[PDB]
Amino acid sequence: ENLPQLKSAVDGLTEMSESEKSGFISLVSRYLSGIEWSKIQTPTDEIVVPYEKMTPVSQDVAETKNLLDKLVVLKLNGGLGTTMGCTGPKSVIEVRDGLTFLDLIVIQIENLNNKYGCKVPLVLMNSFNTHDDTHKIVEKYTNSNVDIHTFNQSKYPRVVADEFVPWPSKGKTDKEGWYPPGHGDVFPALMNSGKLDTFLSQGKEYVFVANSDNLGAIVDLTILKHLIQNKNEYCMEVTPKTLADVKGGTLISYEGKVQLLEIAQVPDEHVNEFKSIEKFKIFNTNNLWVNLKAIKKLVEADALKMEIIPNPKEVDGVKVLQLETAAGAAIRFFDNAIGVNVPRSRFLPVKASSDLLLVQSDLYTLVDGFVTRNKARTNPSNPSIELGPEFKKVATFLSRFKSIPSIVELDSLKVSGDVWFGSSIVLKGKVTVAAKSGVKLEIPDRAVVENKNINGPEDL
């Protein structure tokens, strides 16, 4: 509690840079100091521009090329693969045809630079959990036609919840004593790293930020052209909420400003209202387009005061607090800030096993680096896929599917218990496989499983 005792402890932490100490103290200050639901307003086409209403690029190529000379592409790469049972950066999990997320990213940018003769740089924002591994991995791209920059974001101390002291101040100085404080940190870190000023000197004007695991976040020149023509200093890509997205962060008007609103800022009495997709119709994809000169101005001015997100964790039986911020929450600080409501093709996340099943099946293919949806697929929606904990770890997932089944005509798959799948299986309509406790169920090679429940070996 209070300020200067915490500040003294933090200044004691010789692992932290001066900019890190100051940044962390600033978060703690605002968190300890402190959205009225009734003052919230639903957005309109004046805040959220439909992607269709935007003016397409003209057939004139030199225009496309002038747009691309101003662009820097940034991928958020601070997350480990441990949620999916893998060591190393999440971005080095193989997504399809043997290629990692990062492989696809390098290939896309290389092909942009080929198609158009531009020199679009890639930058990866790493964390202390991914920085060294990433540094070694990216050597593989040495001869690739893309300049790849990396920088490490901030490293803040986990705070012991009960005592409110930095955990490293109590001797917990190994990796478990610290955390990367969210992707909101991308802004000060891009500044603190020196990279922002670099890109500035070269006449770059915009950065396109996206999660390294969103397969849909490809350079879109309609969006960028709009920002230049309308002087929008920030643009969030949003997409309509389906029932799968009810908890997603959304864009509102609040005290005269476009703002991101997340469930955390929403009172208990109001969460059900928040979750209504007729009320709040769109959600943040984390595909963000931001003006570089505006970042520099706002970071230098100490203007970016995003909502603090507690994120408490229990680590080795010690409850800690991890104060973090979100990159989309910065939207309220930028001049002429907007959302662009985009097709869901631009939001294809891999967060679990079930998403790999999506993108590794015949429902998609690699075309020139792009995870391209099968044209045969009649329904504009992807099948719903649910798997038990048996399928959580990627390697176990891959072993439980002798080959990935065809899902091109699938509507829905649910799998529970100890289930194994043979090769060349085809899945259609609504499929359920449910192995009871103590039972292992194996689905034979070349099975066609169609609008059917499988609750035992007695379902052939």
Q: Kindly write down the DSSP assignment for every residue of 259-275, as one continuous string.
A: EEE-GGGS-GGGHHHHT
Domain co-membership, 252 together with 217: yes
State how far the Cα of 123 lies from the Cα of 155, in Å rounded to an integer. 19
Query: DSSP 3-state assignment of 130?
Result: coil
User: Are 43 and 339 spatial neighbours (Cβ–Cβ below 8 Å)?
Assistant: yes
* Residue 154 and residue 296 in one domain: yes
Residue 91 token pair:
């971005």
Judge if 309 and 424 occupy the same domain.
no
Q: Are residues 364 and 335 in the same domain?
A: no
Say if residue 341 is in the same domain as residue 445: no
HSE of 460 in the Cβ direction (CA atoms, 13 Å)? 6
Query: Whose structure tokens read 């957005």?
Result: 43
User: Residue 412: beta bridge partners?
Assistant: 384, 430
List the structure tokens of 7: 């500040």
For 19, the 3-state DSSP assignment is: helix
- Cβ atoms of residues 181 and 31 within 8 Å: no
Q: How far apart are CA 237 and CA 328, in angstroms?
A: 10
- Asked whether 71 and 108 are in contact (CB, 8 A), the reply is no
| Phi/psi of residue 120, nearest 5 degrees | -70, 120
**Sign of torsion over alpha carbons 185, 186, 188, 190:** positive
Retrieve residue 113's tokens.
Answer: 């630079």
DSSP code for 237? E
Same domain, 339 and 365: no
Q: How many CB atoms are closer than 10 A to CB 371?
A: 25
- Tokens found for residue 312: 């408490």
Closest Cα partner for 209 from 89, 148, 124? 124
The half-sphere exposure of 263 on its side-chain side, counting CA atoms within 13 A, is: 12
Tokens 């985009």 identify what position? 342
Same domain flag for 220 and 131: yes
* Main-chain phi, psi angles of 7, to 5 degrees: -65, -40
Per-residue CA distances from 129 to 24, 134, 153, 162, 184 (Å): 18, 10, 10, 26, 17
Residue 432: CATH number of its domain: 2.160.10.10
Angle at 45 between CA 44 and CA 50, to 5 degrees: 130
User: Among the three residues 350, 374, 400, which one is the final residue of a domain in this structure?
Assistant: 350
Task: With CA atoms as reference, report the closest residue to 445 among 411, 410, 413, 401.
Answer: 401
Tokens of 248: 């997603």
In 169-211 the beta strands, taken as DSSP E runs, fall at: 178-179, 206-211
Nearest residue to 17 (alpha-carbon basis) of 141, 155, 172, 200: 155
Distances (CA, A) of 264 to 140, 153, 254, 280, 433: 40, 24, 16, 15, 36
Same domain, 272 and 157: yes
Measure the CA–CA gap between 90 and 215, rounded to whole angstroms.
13
3-state secondary structure of 108: helix
Query: Count of CB atoms within 10 A of residue 408's CB?
Result: 17
What are the two backbone dihedrals, phi and then psi, of residue 6, each rounded to the nearest 5 degrees?
-60, -40
Q: Binding site: residue ranges?
A: 76-79, 90, 153, 182-183, 211-213, 351
What residue has token string 């020199």?
Answer: 119
Using an 8 Å Cβ cutoff, are 207 and 290 in contact?
yes
List, as residue ranges, the binding site for UTP: 76-79, 90, 153, 182, 213, 351
Burial class (CB in 10 A: 0-12, 13-18, 19+), 215: buried
> How many CA within 13 A on the CB side of residue 281?
12
Residues 340 and 373 placed together within one structural domain of the fold: no
Verify that 265 and 253 share a domain, yes or no: yes
E strands, 94-136, in order: 94-96, 99-100, 122-126
Task: Look up the domain containing 367 and give its range.
Answer: 351-460
What does DSSP assign to residue 292?
Answer: H
Quick check: 6 and 25 in contact, CB under 8 A?
yes
CB atoms within 10 A of CB 402: 17
Measured distance CA(34)–CA(46) in Å, rounded: 30
* 371/414 same-domain check: yes
CB 43 within 8 A of CB 33: no
* Boundary of a domain, candidates 350, 371, 402: 350
Cβ burial, residue 241 (10 Å; 0-12/13-18/19+)? buried
CATH number at residue 41: 3.90.550.10
Distance CA 333, CA 192 (A): 19
Q: Which residues of 179-207 are buried (b: 16+ CB within 10 A; e: fewer)?
A: bbbbbbbbbbbbbbbebbeebeeeebbbb
CA 396 to chain centre: 24
What single DSSP character describes residue 405? P
Radius of gyration of the chain (CA): 23
- Rounded Cα gap, residues 204 and 198, in angstroms: 9
Cα–Cα nearest to 362, from 316, 426, 312: 426
Residue where a domain stops, chosen among 323, 350, 377: 350
d(C-alpha 223, C-alpha 328), whole Å: 17
The answer to whether the beta carbons of residues 411 and 430 sit under 8 Å apart is yes
Interaxial angle between packed helices 61-68 and 221-230, expressed in degrees from 0 to 180 and rounded to the nearest 10: 80
CA–CA separation, 286 and 282 (whole Å): 12
Residues 270 and 280 sit within 8 Å (Cβ to Cβ) = no
Distance separating alpha carbons of residues 76 and 65, to the nearest angstrom? 25
What lies within 8 Å, CB to CB, of 232 at 6+ separation is: 226, 289, 291, 336, 337, 338
Q: Is 445 helix (H, G, I), strand (E, B) or coil?
A: coil
Cα–Cα dist 137/132, whole Å: 9
- Per the structure, the count of domains in the chain is 2
User: CB within 8 A of 82, min separation 6: which ones?
Assistant: none
In a shared domain, residues 330 and 356: no
Q: Which positions make up the binding site for substrate?
A: 78-79, 183, 211-213
Residue type for 423, please? S
Using DSSP bridges, classify how beta strands 338-341 and 48-50 pair: parallel, antiparallel or unpaired. parallel
CB 187 within 8 A of CB 327: yes
